[PDB]
């Protein structure tokens, strides 16, 4: 019996796999991080068959469910308690994420306030 979101639509994604960078498989100097290839002869940049795909705006997500977590909320990086009381009037549609840097003593304080306010925390059971 966790916090349901207001409306929980079927999130559909056009593509799930990460776009990866050309020849990032062949080298350790090349990272996965996408770059558009700007070679003159380039299988990829001229859209040949059977190559890695190039990201367009065509793959963009449907505005209704963009940034929507699997639970149905969108994140909002809460940093301290005072910054939670913002979400008070949303709680059905956004969720607090508490930051990495926040100490274990005041993570505890944020979580209990959220629970009072019925704001969904996305990483509550963690630091301890």
């Amino acid at each position: 019996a966790a916090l349901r979101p207001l409306v929980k639509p079927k999130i559909v994604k056009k593509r799930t796999k990460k776009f990866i960078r050309h020849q990032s498989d062949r080298y350790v100097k090349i990272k996965r991080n996408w770059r558009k290839p700007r070679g003159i002869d380039n299988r990829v940049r001229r859209r040949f068959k059977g190559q890695i795909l190039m990201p367009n705006i065509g793959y963009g997500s449907n505005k209704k469910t963009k940034h929507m977590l699997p639970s149905g909320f969108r994140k909002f990086l809460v940093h301290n308690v005072k910054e939670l009381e913002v979400l008070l009037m949303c709680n059905k549609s956004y969720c607090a994420e508490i930051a990495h840097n926040v100490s274990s003593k005041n993570r505890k304080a944020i979580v209990e306030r959220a629970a009072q306010l019925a704001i969904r925390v996305t990483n509550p059971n963690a630091r301890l």
Binding site: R35, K36, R38, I40
Partner: protein, 147 residues
Amino acid sequence: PSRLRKTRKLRGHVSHGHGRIGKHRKHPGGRGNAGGMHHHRINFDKYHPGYFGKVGMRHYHLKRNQSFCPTVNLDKLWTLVSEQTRVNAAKNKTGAAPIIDVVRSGYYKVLGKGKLPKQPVIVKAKFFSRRAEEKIKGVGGACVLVA
């Protein structure tokens, strides 16, 4: 602001906006205004007609203060004086006409552009144009030469 300049967007692109056929070589024309007569001739002789060649008289030890002769047009002669000269006149009933020393306000010649208002004036100046004189006479005034 480098932030706002172009080269920030060109990161990634190979030639850096100078094209890869012809490159950004060092000095392809010749440096500066080279080739005015040969090979940049068209530019110079359809945007700087008259560049090349001499004309007129030399004048060796020119000094500009000799030829100093700033001008004022009748158009705005009354602007030299405070409004209440132009007002206390078109009034008065003596047919007085106030004096406008043009040289005081920093002009030597009184040229003839513009309508003058029907209101007499004594204008003191170093030089006058013919028409500038005639206008003042017709208003009902007097030109006054001054050294």
